[PDB]
Amino acid sequence: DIVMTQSPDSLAVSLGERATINCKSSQNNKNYLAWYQQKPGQPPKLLIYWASTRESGVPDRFSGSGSGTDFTLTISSLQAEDVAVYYCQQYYSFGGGTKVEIKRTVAAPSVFIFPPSDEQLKSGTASVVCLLNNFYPREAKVQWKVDNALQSGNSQESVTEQDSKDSTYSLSSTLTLSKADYEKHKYACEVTHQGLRSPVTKSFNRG
Amino acid sequence: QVQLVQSGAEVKKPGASVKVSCKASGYTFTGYYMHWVRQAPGQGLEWMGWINPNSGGTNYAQKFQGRVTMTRDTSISTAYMELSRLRSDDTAVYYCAKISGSYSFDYWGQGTLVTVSSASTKGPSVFPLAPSSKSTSGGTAALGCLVKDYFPEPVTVSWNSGALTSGVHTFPAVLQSSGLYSLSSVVTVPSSSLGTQTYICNVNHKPSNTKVDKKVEPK
């Protein structure tokens, strides 16, 4: 019957600055609220229990506060090592999680386009890959154009975890067509991003 | 040293059952309730239930009542979670976690991936993403490998057998409507290297016992 809601769902904070994550519950004198850090491929790690007691070994920059229904995980001086998803927990309810990332200066993507290989074409399919490399922030618009026809809903995007070294993202966009569809046309990926003064288009002719 | 060590990833078809184990050591097994928590890929944490290892008494989330069974074997300090009548939305990493006196989970198993799907295990097809002028910007060329149509997760990718880590980006897999996964791995290198330095992506799909090494050559 208890529902935990975290705010915000995602958070970008500059290196060495303060990050705060909120958690409110639906609802001996203990508060029975825990905070967990989770990095990809790892189980969550307990940071704070009883709302404000740090687990030994957790850096002092992690602190918890709050009472009753409203609780807050604070990270003073965010490190790149703290990029993770944080969860609150009360009894058997978990918050929905809050992604924490390093905020950094805008970095425009370098754009690269890869035609389908002949190996793939012989297998009967054609994947066109558009690479957006080392950019920030994560929002980027990738438009596919096939003989200048704007493509909608037939590509798939994937985005890396933020790079711990330079705090950037990379993104791949894959347009997949049947070999037959690919042969019927003569291919461009147009990238819009905060760091680009005008869109960058990379294109190639089939053949 | 408290450790909770879970059994390995499993793949199940819809309608089947899965049983995950969790071997505890480093503390008195019967003194702490063991809970199960699951996490679908990219999603949050979902509590499933607990077992009192000292009695076998259980309590399950209403969402799993009638499908989950938790048991333990105290002689080998092992907790078990069985989930039956599986559907693809039971695809998740299942965790065992020991509750503490503060009603927090201070110790977690490493997780057990359970994939529920009708798809058959299948190694990837690996296709080069070749560097050319159309993947060259300011003396930097990008190249990569497309790792297509495999099941289940995961695959690992390295470059030049792990000697090449700078500039490497391996993208999270996307699950296609076919039920198969595909990803790309890319690396950015100096353009001046393309005529002298060989680039090979090493693709390892342990579920299908597939390893592919693909040379990626310019143009």
Side-chain angles (χ1 to χ4, degrees):
Chain A
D1 302 333
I2 290 181
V3 180
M4 312 299 285
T5 46
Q6 298 177 220
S7 196
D9 303 313
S10 177
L11 172 54
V13 161
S14 300
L15 206 63
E17 300 296 353
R18 192 178 68 164
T20 278
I21 301 174
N22 177 261
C23 173
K24 44 195 64 183
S25 160
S26 275
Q27 183 72 11
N28 197 31
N29 261 318
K30 254 70 164 68
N31 280 295
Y32 295 135
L33 186 120
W35 289 99
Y36 303 78
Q37 179 191 68
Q38 187 178 32
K39 302 189 182 171
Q42 293 189 340
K45 172 190 188 163
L46 183 63
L47 305 168
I48 306 288
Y49 55 99
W50 281 332
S52 73
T53 305
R54 207 162 30 240
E55 181 75 14
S56 305
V58 170
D60 288 17
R61 65 175 173 282
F62 289 87
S63 63
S65 55
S67 269
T69 277
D70 193 19
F71 295 92
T72 293
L73 174 67
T74 291
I75 315 173
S76 62
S77 177
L78 192 65
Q79 298 180 17
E81 289 87 335
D82 307 328
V83 174
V85 179
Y86 295 79
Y87 291 95
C88 60
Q89 167 245 341
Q90 195 171 52
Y91 301 109
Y92 305 146
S93 298
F94 290 94
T98 288
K99 300 173 170 303
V100 171
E101 76 186 50
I102 301 306
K103 181 185 174 298
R104 58 145 292 163
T105 63
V106 164
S110 297
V111 184
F112 310 85
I113 188 163
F114 304 96
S117 75
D118 300 337
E119 320 177 18
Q120 184 186 18
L121 288 177
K122 195 58 184 312
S123 91
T125 61
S127 300
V128 199
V129 185
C130 188
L131 172 64
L132 282 68
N133 199 50
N134 291 7
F135 62 96
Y136 192 85
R138 194 180 187 290
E139 293 84 344
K141 186 200 298 183
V142 182
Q143 296 177 284
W144 280 103
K145 295 169 161 186
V146 179
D147 287 332
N148 273 344
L150 303 105
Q151 295 309 293
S152 162
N154 59 359
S155 58
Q156 54 211 355
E157 295 185 3
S158 186
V159 182
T160 53
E161 294 276 1
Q162 183 178 52
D163 178 271
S164 60
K165 155 195 179 59
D166 56 40
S167 304
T168 65
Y169 296 94
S170 303
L171 172 151
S172 71
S173 174
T174 300
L175 179 72
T176 291
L177 305 172
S178 67
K179 192 188 186 292
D181 305 320
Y182 178 73
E183 299 294 318
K184 285 173 181 159
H185 302 100
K186 189 75 182 175
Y187 295 85
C189 163
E190 168 168 13
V191 172
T192 290
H193 186 263
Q194 184 175 348
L196 303 172
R197 289 282 179 279
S198 75
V200 164
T201 299
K202 304 284 159 181
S203 61
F204 66 91
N205 287 350
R206 179 185 41 78
Chain B
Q1 51 288 344
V2 172
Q3 319 183 43
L4 308 178
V5 177
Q6 308 185 209
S7 45
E10 304 195 30
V11 173
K12 292 298 182 179
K13 296 174 171 321
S17 296
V18 69
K19 183 173 214 175
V20 180
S21 72
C22 168
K23 172 165 190 51
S25 60
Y27 69 100
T28 303
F29 184 59
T30 53
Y32 297 85
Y33 283 41
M34 184 74 59
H35 297 229
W36 291 83
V37 174
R38 77 172 185 185
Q39 185 171 40
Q43 308 184 25
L45 295 167
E46 186 180 27
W47 176 86
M48 300 181 70
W50 53 251
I51 179 157
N52 179 351
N54 196 47
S55 71
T58 62
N59 182 54
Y60 309 138
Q62 289 176 343
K63 192 176 197 63
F64 302 110
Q65 266 293 343
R67 298 204 297 139
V68 76
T69 302
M70 304 170 172
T71 55
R72 86 303 183 202
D73 185 336
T74 64
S75 63
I76 59 163
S77 301
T78 297
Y80 302 94
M81 188 280 302
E82 189 177 353
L83 192 56
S84 67
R85 300 186 273 127
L86 288 172
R87 291 172 187 253
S88 56
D89 59 27
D90 298 311
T91 293
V93 176
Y94 291 76
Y95 294 106
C96 64
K98 165 203 150 303
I99 193 90
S100 69
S102 68
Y103 281 85
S104 51
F105 301 111
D106 47 345
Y107 296 99
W108 294 70
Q110 80 276 22
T112 298
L113 181 55
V114 181
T115 307
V116 181
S117 165
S118 329
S120 302
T121 301
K122 187 193 171 292
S125 301
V126 180
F127 303 119
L129 305 163
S132 52
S133 49
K134 313 282 198 255
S135 74
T136 293
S137 66
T140 294
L143 53 105
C145 287
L146 175 68
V147 180
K148 197 177 181 277
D149 293 341
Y150 68 84
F151 176 89
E153 286 267 69
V155 288
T156 59
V157 179
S158 66
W159 285 88
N160 293 351
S161 316
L164 177 52
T165 68
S166 284
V168 172
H169 291 111
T170 302
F171 291 98
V174 302
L175 175 53
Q176 310 170 91
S177 57
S178 63
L180 308 180
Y181 298 87
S182 58
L183 61 80
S184 270
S185 180
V186 301
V187 64
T188 57
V189 309
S191 297
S192 50
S193 299
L194 290 179
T196 55
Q197 176 54 48
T198 44
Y199 298 103
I200 296 169
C201 65
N202 324 106
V203 178
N204 194 17
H205 184 241
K206 306 209 189 175
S208 62
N209 188 23
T210 299
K211 181 174 177 277
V212 180
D213 296 309
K214 179 63 68 177
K215 183 187 285 87
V216 179
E217 277 172 318
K219 291 231 65 186

